[PDB]
Amino acid sequence: SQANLMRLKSDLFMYPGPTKDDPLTVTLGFTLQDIVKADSSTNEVDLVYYEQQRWKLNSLMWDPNEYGNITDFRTSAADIWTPDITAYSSTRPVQVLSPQIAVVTHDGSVMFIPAQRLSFMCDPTGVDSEEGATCAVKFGSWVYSGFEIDLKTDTDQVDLSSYYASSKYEILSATQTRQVQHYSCCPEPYIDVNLVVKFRER
Template sequence: MLGKISFLSLLLGIECYTIAEETLLHQNLLNGYNKRIRPGADRTKPVNLDASFTLTAIKEFSESEGKIAVVGAFRFNWEDERLIWDPATYGGDLHNTIMYFQDIWVPQFVNMNPYNELKRVGLDEMYCTLTETGQVTFIPPDLYESTCDADVTYYPFDKQKCSLLYYIPGYYISDMNITAASSTLDMDLYEKNGLWQVLETSFSVKTSAKNFQLIDLTISMTRRTTYYVAGLLLPIVLMNFIQLFVFLLPVESGERVGFSITVLLAVAVFLTIIQEKLPEASEPNVSVLTYKLLVDMIIGCGMILAVVIGMRFYHRSDDIRVPWILRGFTRCFYGCCTPINSKQSVNPDEVVDIKSEKPSRGSDGVSITWNDVGKAFDRVCLPLFFLSLVMNNIVYFIIIFV
């Protein structure tokens, strides 16, 4: 088979270069080549550099650390007249070749806002593609990390916008003219992130006040909220309203205070979890969810205080007279719905002295006990705290979605 192909190649006059010819090409191109000097025969004109970026994945975005890490690859194109050759000299069909990037001049881009140490774009073992016309293509894939201050005001319904800035130290606009090959990032190879959804991207070249150019990669994204709604918001809302059942719990069980404290501690645990996920800085804003949980805790503390007060009413001795203001309170919020001890008859043998009449007995002869005061207090606290929780949740969702 190889003999037939060789025979046909000779018969048809097909030319093909050999490894010796490509080796000779590399030797000739690098002979006297100084990789520390930028291309350009006319030193008064800048090197025209086309740049673009292909985004393949968002590896990490940390709100607490203010860090974004993306996986992708830059694509740089420029012309170096020192790397032009005649294919006829090297087998006739040597139109392209690959050369080690450390052997020729390449733009040394560095990150303007790095998260860790400053490093150049491109790994140590990388190659460039060259054409016979001197066109050089350099595609360095890497993990690119940068700082990005998160705005967690509407967490977990927040949107983030991060920029990665790159420039070439030592080169000004008179030496290097960078143009964007595309106004957006190439998303053809992008793999969807389970936590973040990319809304839009932009790729632009800016000129700073110091007369050098910056490459700006901007990614706008929004958080996928299904997990947070099911695993964070719904449990918080349910725990809020479970607290209300403390006013329906029988006093005889003796578990009212313990129940209230347990639910309040659960809310505090959620508050701690959220605070660990969010940045400690107060700028640009603290998460609205943090304020909501803080109000939930205040309402929970109010419930515990109300339970303690109600327990004092329930366990107060009937020998202590009920003040007139509590009798009116009880009649208003409890007696108006169901008669208080309406079947209780007045003992005919009881002698009542006007000067020593107990305040717990009204003018209609119906007695009001401390137990009745406690029940009236529960009837007031239940709708009061229910409305407080409803208003707190309504205000939170209005701020988030309006």
């Protein structure tokens, strides 16, 4: 049983990443926990969130029946390829708040949900009014175009149910949407997901 999982892991373990002839869909979502701080002397906002990532690899699928009906397993995110999804407008290295561990299911799907703290460019002006401040941060692949990584958002609207009820800031609304961009210079689609948050002093 343990034996079967060890033998499965052994069987599965090098994937060289997506290419134009082997493109990868990556699904991205956000669970917003807390806007910790909004600094109007520098125009930075610090946000604690869970970042849901999902993608699927043919190289990660197996038949449960050849392995004692294991339908999934957990593994350190260092043991596998993960996509290079990045905040394009951070002002500090992102801080990881949790272990980095994925779930791999028999169909080759990978789910990875790291907690993070992110400082990003944001003018908090209006946060002390009723209408709030509005800020936005783009995430996209660092080096893959829409031809090699097809970045999208999941069905669910932004998850607000775990947002800290006693935060110094309340979330008035949050959206996550995909943007597809084309430049005349270049043939490739360029994709980014925007997280737009509207927030004010509680």
